[model samples]
Target chain A: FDFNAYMGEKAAAVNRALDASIPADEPPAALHEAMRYALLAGGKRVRPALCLAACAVVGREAWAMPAAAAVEMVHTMSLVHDDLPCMDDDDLRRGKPTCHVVYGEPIAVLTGDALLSLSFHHMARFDSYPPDIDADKHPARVVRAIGELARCIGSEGLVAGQVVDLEMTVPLERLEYIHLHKTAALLEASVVIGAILGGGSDEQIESLRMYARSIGLLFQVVDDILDVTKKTTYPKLLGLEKSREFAEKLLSDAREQLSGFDQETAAPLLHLANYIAYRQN
Target chain B: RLYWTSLIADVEAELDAAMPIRTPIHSAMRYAVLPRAPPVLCVAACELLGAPREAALPAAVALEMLHAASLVHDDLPCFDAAPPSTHAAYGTDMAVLAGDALFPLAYTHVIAHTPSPDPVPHAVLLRVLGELARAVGSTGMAAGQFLDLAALGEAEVMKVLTKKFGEMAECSAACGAMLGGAGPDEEAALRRYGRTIGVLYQLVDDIRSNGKMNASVLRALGMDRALGIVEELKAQAKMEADRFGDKYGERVLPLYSFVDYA
Candidate 1:
């Protein structure tokens, strides 16, 4: 499978969904502008791609569209907020002035918020779940998925990881915690939510959860290996070979989870891990 | 009073546990809302809606957390230029993290504790998140805060304050009503009461900030006429509480009592 082609297809689809997510013509055009400013400016839609791939891996293509869209919106919110003066305070993102740089801190802050709410609003639809599941169960399962996404994004996961990363001394365990929670948690949620809505069975869900965890860890390990500007990293802690081993080990471990499913069905996710491992930037 | 006391205890306990102690962010979050959770309006809304007090616990705690988060950011140097306030004492950087962390904590606590076996429905929970987000985000407090930062005129401030403070009260009761299993009519009445509560909060806040009901159109209306408008809004809010009481009998009396609080 050409993972780039799959990612391209999903990226275009999700961008349209995202474009339509906020009301551009609404009364609060400023708010909408701020939201669209961050959202529409393109990035690799990694999280949404993961969501769509998981849905396809479960043998559903059109299902989980809202979840796919939501993950992208959330990824956008995280970046917009991370670039705020209060957070990472970067002046440039993706070779352009950051959201705060153009919109100012106040609106930049609200833009993140608008995106956050919009993501929930979209994901809460749950209309695209597998058609065969008991119809009554749809809303409840949607709640569960939302709750899963909520937990991943919240204090126990993303926020917690972020605060800890800033405060903790650079022990290996500390570095690992930051890696898993700040970066890994949302990635795991992107897949888990898609899998849940796609009607994956318990075994498939569990396997995918493990698959997501490995890739999430793998992505971070690779990022750390490539990272030269950050304060701490896997290379700093364990040297080049160990970091390389860690990334390859995670890729191989994630592959194990997909082995249980039909090779064709799992092709996107299987290819995804390799793509994450090999990407140049 | 007994209901308030027990629920406040629960709120305090949850706050203690909700934010972990691994970093100063913990302390900062704690600092923002200490002794503020279990605010009267939230507890009152929950109880008046007739759900188990536990039903309101999640929403109440979440409200306090969000409210405190807003204050943490609002007091930052660029905004209010206020001194090291609440968690800001530890430093604004941690305070920023605390506020951001609390936004998620609100949802986390709500999802974790919103009760089951007659659970808050998925749709209701989703709406609760939206309402709170709207109240706190671009459409609400952020809008008001932007105006406040600009030193925009009194009329402008009033418009956004209603959006900001009023939405705060509105979403709190709305979430409580949803969690408490209110029907449409009951929820509407509660939300109206909440709208009143929020407007009242800002009304009172203006007085606190300037030593008179002196901001917004009230400044134009002058104190005596402004006082009349306050009475009008109070009466307006009480009528809604009365409607709720009429629907639920004396069970809504505690809610009615709040109409007169401001």
Candidate 2:
């Protein structure tokens, strides 16, 4: 499969779905703009693609559209909140002005709030109206996805990493914990939700979860290597060569989970791991 | 009073368990969630419908979590700005993250703790979750906050109060009723009852505070008109509350008490 073409196609689908999810011309026009601003400002759409791909690995990718869009909503809002002057205090996101910078801190804060709330709203609306899917099973599946997504982003998961990251530690274990929670938690959710909505068996879902966990950590290790400017990272803890070796191990570990599936069906996920490891940004 | 005490105790314990103050952000979240509108109206609403108290406990806690999360954000220097708010105590950055964490924690708590399939079906739980999200979403509490800040007149204030206060209250009653397997008519009536009392609560608050508080019906309507409106609302609230008395009998006391107190 042409990996680049596959990514492009998936990203486009996600972008379109996301655009349709939040109406631009709504009653609360400013908020609607702020939400779309951060959401559609164009990251790599990595999480949504991962969600859709995981769904494909089990069943139809279309079944996970709501989950895919939802994961991105949460991911985008996390970025918005993380960039607040009270948080990372960054001036830019993806080369554009941050939400707080453009909309002011209050609107920025609410933008994150609205996005977070809407993420669950979007997912809970998943009906699987596609003729191929049974409508009866959707309520339970959507509920489980909601719970999984919520838990991963809450204090126990993403927020835990964020709070600890604020404390800022250099220990390798702490670094790994933060990486696993901050970046990898959502990544794990993205894949797990996709698998759930795709109707994968428990065995397949657990396998995909392991795969997601490895690549999630893999993503950060590679990020540290690429951007060594950070004061605390895998590269700083273990040096660039050792970090690269760790990345290789993580990549291998991630691929091992995919071994049970057909190579053709697993191609997108396999390529996703490689993409995380090799991507420049 | 015994009923109120038990519900309050349950909500506080749940919040304390959910929010372990291991870090500054956690502390900030705990601070916000620890204080609120007694956090019992949800459980009260559920029990009013004859459901077991345990059934609605998680949703009740979740209500307070959402309320606290909004307050944490609303108290930002850019939003409401006050002395010793979460942002004031923890700084704006930590407050932002704290509130962000609480927003989803509200849902996660309910999802994890709420008894499902038997007591509350998956469909009902899903509806309750949806109601929770919508009550706090772009068009809900956030919109209310936005409009309140930009509000120029009585009309705007009413809309803001509806979204800010009425939405949450409505969600509380509607969710509790749904969890207890309310018929559509009962749920709808409870929603109306919740919204009316919610607005009345704010109106009464403004009158008591002499229009110094945020949503000032006293300021919106003149003193005489405001006072008169409260009396009208009191009567209206009673009518709504009494509608359930025949069906729920003495179990309807909580609903009536909310109106009388408000």
Candidate 3:
């Protein structure tokens, strides 16, 4: 139930898996170096840890680390590309030089792409090889998870959000749609994939999806409130007090979904929801 | 020839329908997706597999869109610094967005079109995506391009060509063959054939650069031997296309005659 302890323990698993996923020494030194550099650079490991937490809630955390790390790879890939010179062009990210800033544009682009493909490759390696669980079903779940991740980031998902975000002053609804697709889509996938690979029932998976989406949007809402630059955000559209209240309600709603599971089993996830709602930079 | 004429038109129709001009990003995407040049390599490889135009539609479009997307990125000031490209036409910002947006659409197009009540197997579509992703990702085209810029040597040119140029053609043919229900042997043959085309296309590109590329065949093998090399690689690619057509009895002219007509 202790949030910091949970992060301390589980995030190590995420980092170790991330390191193993893409080693620093591959054939193309520069490309591999850029990918590993971007990936291993530290963050809160929020999405991957969320995925791992979801699996533990079902008492099946043992086999889900690959997917857990896979989501973070995708997250890191996005950051690398998002910070490219052609995009937002930030020179620094998370207290270090951005990927493109450090590695130059072309390699940075390839690094993001390599990380993305590697994320799927990482997920594909998750075949449980279950001797007793009707072996066919296990690999199929992993495949489904990959497809789900692809869809969430593809044209109709994060990319859609990105393209629209690049557009001139858009409508309020479209902006929200961008957040839902761009930010919430991956977060939702992180939790939902954990539930799915953990062998949660369809009903349980769908509930976790809802919980994940609420937190995903809540994360963005707070981000928008904290923003010093960029276009219209949720707070800009709704004002700060109302945005705070929205985050509070969604926090309650996310926890309510977890209520159906055992209290102790869901403790990490429950505390996670609270940590996210109250965290200050 | 008329067969290709109408078939490529059909493929364009698919692209046109998918890329609507709602926003500037949409407009940039459409221009890149539906390029000024015809999709010769894509259409040839697809229809050569014995499937009808519709069968190879998504794979062909996926290849073209991906190619366009890469160009949009390459034309960025950070890369080629082109002023006449989409980056200049639409502004670098949307150019970047167009490339990013098109990539997902390319995959979505494949999955959307190849649904499984049954024409192409569901598993086959997934394979198509995986192959395309591998080729374009770090280990493939991107790596090829990154490494190519390094000014390696005449010796490494062929390897670069295989990665940067060959991978896309190989991907197109591989996808086309499988989508059209090619046997395992046929898929492998088409992949080899496409790789040949990729090299040949560039050896002529440098000499004119399409098989011992980067350094013009003119310099590497000398004009006559380079010409001979071109002839040999062309003949090899043609043999595979002819073999596929002979086995399945589909039109192979789009690719088989590509060397001559192109």
Candidate 4:
């Protein structure tokens, strides 16, 4: 279970799907350009791939692809908005100029806007087929998933998290609160959606959810550790060694949750949790 | 069903009970939102969704806050050409505070009133908040305003209208529907309904903005073309609604029926 190889294959699929989703000749030239610029700017498609992998673990690999794609759309939309002038005002994304820098602010904004709507479009379009598989049993569940994703990316989740990041002059005990909503929410949603789409049982879903939470926290802890230990260090807000130890502990907890699942089915996910602990970026 | 209705009533009572008292800044915020349109719209959305009034009330209030933020930013000199619009009793700074107050308040209300204690409710609150941030922040409403300002031609204006008013309205409905337990299929239908109604709403708005067209007479689109587009969108909306059958059909009926033939 090589996590890097797994992620690389998943990332390639995600990029292909994303490229296909964008039209070569959209109505507004600026919008098309802006969308292309943002989508083409490469980042690890970990969220979507994790989603697909989660579905695979549940034996519903085919059904989860679009859900995986929808999650990516949500992630990409966030990135597009985050790069806007009113937001982080970043000039670079994935080694390229930010969408706003390349496409002008207005189109950059619209591209993000269109992507958000389109993400819902993808979420809402797919019906749970294989009628025996009742992923669609609770249509409200899927709706809930979309709504939750919206809320997570909205003010309370990423935006609030970003606000805290921007407004922070001193460290606060509430640092975990910001991290949970900002980074962890999306990661949690990724796995949750995968479970929902895969038609996992309630107990299974709950266990996976716990797995998601632990890993999401671990993911942030590792990121914090990297921010401190690397060249582009995140500075010792909580000290580097502490951050590393915290991430390692969380990763251990994350793997512990999978103890109830079949080892063969959960192996990839277990590896994924481990991979995040050691990831450099 | 009766139990659900009572639950809804209880929620509504909570909302009515919890209505924000209008301070000077609150009044400024309320004025920007014009409580009538958005509040009524949100309440109607709640009823349609079967959400507990308590749940819907906080969400509605949060929406108003988000809307107020939009108006404050929209009126900013950088965007819309409108001047500082506070009455003598309040100032522009109050407007900014009013908007800022709504942001955190919306989150607070959502965190408190979410239906279940599960992370799902909190996640939903975050999604609504994210929608608001994107909507009013750079990509959603603010971008629309910027597009409107940069409007140099009819085509650009149309694009702006589509992005700004059309998408905003659609996002509102989409958000509400998502909150209300709309499934993927229902969500799509509602989104289409929102998009079509938004486009039609803009068409009417444009006609009204032109100022010469009478409400009864087809003065704006030469009767035939205007009627044609309106009917086409209405039909499309109906078609989209029909796909969901009983779930969303009734709520969308008004979108087609509420005709203003100016």
* Better structure of 1 and 2 per DockQ: 2
The lDDT leader among the candidates is: 2
Per-prediction tally of clashes: 0, 1, 11, 17
> What is the per-residue lDDT of model 1 for residues A82-152, given as tens digits with 9 covering 90 to 100?
88776688779678899888888867766766667667656654443446555565566566677778778
lDDT against the true structure, per candidate, is 0.70, 0.78, 0.70, 0.58
**Candidate 1 residue-wise lDDT, B1-262, digit = tens:** 3555666777878878876676436656676777321255665666654667666677878878777777666656655443335544876557666676777778668777776446666667766766676667666666555555544445433565566566677777777777767788777777877776667655644543411011254554466755665776677877877775435445434543443343
Better by DockQ, candidate 4 or 3: 3
True-vs-predicted CA distance for residue B192, candidate 4, Å:
11
Error of 2 at A220 (Å): 1.6
Local accuracy of candidate 2 as per-residue lDDT tens digits, B103-181 = 7888888888787767787888888888888888987888877767754456444546777776778788787778777
TM-score of each: 0.88, 0.92, 0.84, 0.64
State the DockQ of every prediction. 0.40, 0.65, 0.31, 0.10
In order, the candidates keep a fraction of the true contacts of 0.35, 0.71, 0.31, 0.00
Candidates ranked by DockQ, best first?
A: 2, 1, 3, 4
Quote the lDDT for B25 in model 3: 63
**Candidate achieving higher TM-score, 3 or 4:** 3
Report each candidate's C-alpha RMSD, comma-separated, in the order given: 3.6, 2.8, 4.3, 8.9
